[PDB]
Amino acid sequence: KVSGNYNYLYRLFRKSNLKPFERDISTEIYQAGNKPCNGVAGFNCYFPL
Amino acid sequence: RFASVYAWNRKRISNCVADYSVLYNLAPFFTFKCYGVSPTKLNDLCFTNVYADSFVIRGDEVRQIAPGQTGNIADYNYKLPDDFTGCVIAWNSNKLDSKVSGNYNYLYRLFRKSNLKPFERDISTEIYQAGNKPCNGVAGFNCYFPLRSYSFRPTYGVGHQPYRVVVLSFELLHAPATVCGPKKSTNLVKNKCVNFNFNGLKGTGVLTESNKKFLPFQQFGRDIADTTDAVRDPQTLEILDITPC
Amino acid sequence: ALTQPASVSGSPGQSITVSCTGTSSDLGNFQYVSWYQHHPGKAPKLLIYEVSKRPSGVSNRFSGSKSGNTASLTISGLQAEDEADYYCCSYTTTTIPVAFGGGTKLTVLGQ
Amino acid sequence: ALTQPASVSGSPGQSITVSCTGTSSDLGNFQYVSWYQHHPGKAPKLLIYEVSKRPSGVSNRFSGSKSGNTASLTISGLQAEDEADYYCCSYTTTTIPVAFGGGTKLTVLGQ
Amino acid sequence: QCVNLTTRTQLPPAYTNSFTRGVYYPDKVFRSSVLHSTQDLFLPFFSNVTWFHVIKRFDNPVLPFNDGVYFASIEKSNIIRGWIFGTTLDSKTQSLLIVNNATNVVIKVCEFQFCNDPFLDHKNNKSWMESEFRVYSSANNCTFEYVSQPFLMDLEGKQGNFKNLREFVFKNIDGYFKIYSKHTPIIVREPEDLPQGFSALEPLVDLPIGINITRFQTLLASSSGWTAGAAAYYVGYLQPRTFLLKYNENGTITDAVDCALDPLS
Amino acid sequence: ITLKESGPTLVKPTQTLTLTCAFSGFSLNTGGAGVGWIRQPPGKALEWLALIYWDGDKRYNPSLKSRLAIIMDTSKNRVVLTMTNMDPVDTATYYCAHHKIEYIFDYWGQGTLVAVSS
Amino acid sequence: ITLKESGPTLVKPTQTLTLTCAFSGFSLNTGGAGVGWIRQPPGKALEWLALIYWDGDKRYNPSLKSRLAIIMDTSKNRVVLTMTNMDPVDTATYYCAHHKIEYIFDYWGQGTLVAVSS
Ligand SMILES: *[C@@H]1O[C@H](CO)[C@@H](O)[C@H](O)[C@H]1NC(C)=O
Ligand SMILES: *[C@@H]1O[C@H](CO)[C@@H](O)[C@H](O)[C@H]1NC(C)=O
Ligand SMILES: *[C@@H]1O[C@H](CO)[C@@H](O)[C@H](O)[C@H]1NC(C)=O
Ligand SMILES: *[C@@H]1O[C@H](CO)[C@@H](O)[C@H](O)[C@H]1NC(C)=O
């Protein structure tokens, strides 16, 4: 797309690695280790796709 | 005192260990997402060397100084390359780089003679004409001074806060490697089949205490098979024997 | 400049709300106000630093909130020595940059 | 950006060549640049897509080639109705994503 | 400061049959009572080291650096100050400059335009001087700084009873330059030729350079003129050969024999 | 293939232009193709206005976002461009065209010219 | 932290006021922090004279520059503040405070009560 195609998404991180041929369809807010963070985004919390 | 965008100083940090964890307890930052790489792998990735660059930015237009974006203070100032090997960190430093009347020690260059190559320390300033007017030490019509000091006011507030930003430039495995982040330490468990790793000593075996002592120039221990069997412990000064199965 | 009523009174002990206001053009605003009390012949000390935090080592019976051009405090625990002079301060961008309230004269209601 | 000469002239029959160029910083690696022709009072039509690929319906006399930063087209065997408004259109990443020539007006010397 | 006298008379050298010295530790790996046959760039056993005797004499020549050499100087007044490095002599390439002028020893890796002959030693009669340390003149783009503690100093004028010998072995692997330092005290003898003895040598430092060094020169400590003592330094080569090392129970090399000398070896 | 362009002849200075263009015959089972609108006045060269894909995405020229709207029929009949708050420099001719990414404008319509009544 | 303010009390109207404000314990290796000079006229709106940072720059109130002068000490002793040709409208008490760019006022002194001798 001439100004950018944003219809294709990719994943930057998970909780851990993944076994072969597996599908991680589930999407949720990801926190970093020990900080209590849920519901919305912010510090050490943003949408992984 | 913190470096600006016009007099940006290439801070050189070498021969140490670089843990970026002590900054998290300061305040909720303006941004956290590093631009070259993800912020979830800042520790395990080991680089050869680091270059730090410090910037005071007037207003909140640090978005336009990006690897892929330009601007008034990104084409006639420090210019971030689009292939930048490193990342950014910006945080709201209202406690230091502000004045009640104005931070008149700083300056901005709105525009220059021409577009500049990135990673060029541009600090020379001059009076600028208007197209083709001859200008030699004169001011007024068609000769206007293109610099102005930073003005911090309490009435400004949001939209004029500093948000001090430091960029970090790395090199991917071409120089000698001195500075990166460390790892964690798991405590020793005696007489248990552990997959040990003493700073690269890969192998599996049980761990006992050895009565023999090493010399201060000694770190490892070999055998007839030419393999590790009894080594000095990494973070504590005693000699541990790797008893096999 | 800042304005406030001079004769301030209310319910003794607790449940008193005191306020400061003014003009958004004369007072340039956008600076978090601080508010102070003065004692006749004694050593004075500020009761509220910025709008809403409470420092340690002082009384923790005070609360505050500032919206737009109007700042206010809710004051609890009024003893017999509650007499003071309440002066609120901000940054006035027109002239005389640091103004101090409009003056208060408070009475006691311990008896 | 993208630029070309405003007008060009020559002897009828042969000996004509029209070129375009642009700044390499604005130009996104120089792919998919096309050559069109506009007529007065008629709809414009496509002649050359991506430098040197020939679409259907055009003659073999039209040719195009690009060297370094400069692209160009040549035509041999000119006729009395071969006057044109040859445009080059290209992709520019920093500014507006498409750029459309600088204007051309070919004239002949047959009369 | 640098003094350009631009004249010198040179004395012919001598040859000293070095017997046993020239062994050093391979790495920081301990082995218990295991006879190892290791091939490395060593100093040959029973080899002629070239004896430069400097007395009214100021000889700091270019030394034949072939990526690892041997320098045994019998010194008592801490004459060895630094080491001129590089290849181009006009501040165009990177070079190393170590100075131990005080307890703040500094190693600078940068571009250096050395003078003709910056002798550290001159003035104050017999008392050696710390001046003329600024050997270079110009720099292009400086790269590396390093700060280190010194070794045992020397108390200014010190002539006679030459108990000390300083052995500097220069090497480099993958651009990493290795300095091998060995200070041997209580050698109660006249300097002359080397005596018989052996010692285990440990690796101290290894610093990156990035530039393959071709030449290096010696920095030694009126504007010119000095009645110096019996200055003695021996230069020697390094060549790749095999040893046989006797590790004891304490990791000290008790014996070391070169295989390629005589058919008994 | 036919492309039909319709628009007003003269418009008021405070009126909004409603240009329509109809296309007959395309391979709609594709990706990246679409319908584009371009304009030019006499005395100055060409400049691009807008392009729509088949997924409903609208791409206008920058700094002209608010005064450009697109009605897409979702019936393969016609595409409408409605532009508000017109300027007498925009009195120009308008071409509706097909837009791939290699062929920047593959087939060109006849277009319609418009002028201001002021 | 203690701040002590010292100066004369029985002052003639033609006599210049020399007031020293002394502090004990502060991290001077910082920016944006300073000392503020604060008036208390009785029953009226108070006014401000001078806030001085550690940079040495001057931030004077408008149209009152002839009544105020500021003197350093540069030995962690105090700050000397001199008022020239004072008017009898300010028979009042004087205070000095730690004023910075985020905290408004930090800690005060004892303050001096002065009146006109006429
Ligand atoms: C590291 O370990 C050594 C040996 O146990 C100890 O002496 C030293 O204090 C430790 N340092 C830190 C920072 O834990
Ligand atoms: C050392 O030098 C002496 C005198 O020049 C010579 O006789 C002897 O053979 C030399 N020995 C070696 C091993 O080069
Ligand atoms: C040093 O390295 C360069 C790198 O190409 C090589 O050309 C040269 O032969 C080497 N040796 C010397 C003595 O310069
Ligand atoms: C090794 O060291 C021990 C303890 O210092 C000592 O008693 C022993 O003699 C040494 N063994 C030798 C001579 O290698």
Residue numbers in the entry:
A (entry chain A): 446 to 494
B (entry chain C): 348 to 592
C (entry chain K), D (entry chain L): 3 to 113
E (entry chain B): 14 to 68, 77 to 242, 256 to 299
F (entry chain H), G (entry chain I): 2 to 119
Task: List sentences from the manuscript.
We obtained cryo-EM reconstructions of these complexes at 3.0–3.8 Å and performed local refinement to further improve the densities around the binding interface between RBD and antibodies, enabling reliable analysis of the mode of interaction.
In the structures of the Omicron S trimer bound with the other two antibodies, the S is observed assuming a configuration with two ‘up’ RBD and one ‘down’ RBD. These structural observations suggest that the binding of the three NAbs can result in a change in the conformational states of RBD, akin to ACE2 receptor, modulating/interfering with viral attachment. Distinct from XGv051, the NAbs XGv264 and XGv286 bind patches surrounding the right shoulder of RBD with a similar binding mode and the binding region is broadly similar in locations to those observed for LY-CoV1404, XGv289 and XGv265, antibodies known to potently neutralize most VOCs.3 Specially, structures of XGv286 and XGv264 resemble those of XGv289 and XGv265, respectively. Compared to XGv265, XGv264 established two additional hydrogen bonds formed by N30 and E103 from heavy chain and T345 and K440 from RBD, respectively, conferring a considerably bigger surface area on RBD (850 Å2 vs 700 Å2 buried by XGv265 ), rationalizing improved binding and neutralizing activities against Omicron. Similarly, XGv289 and XGv286 shared almost same epitope residues, revealing conserved interactions at the interface for their high neutralizing potency.
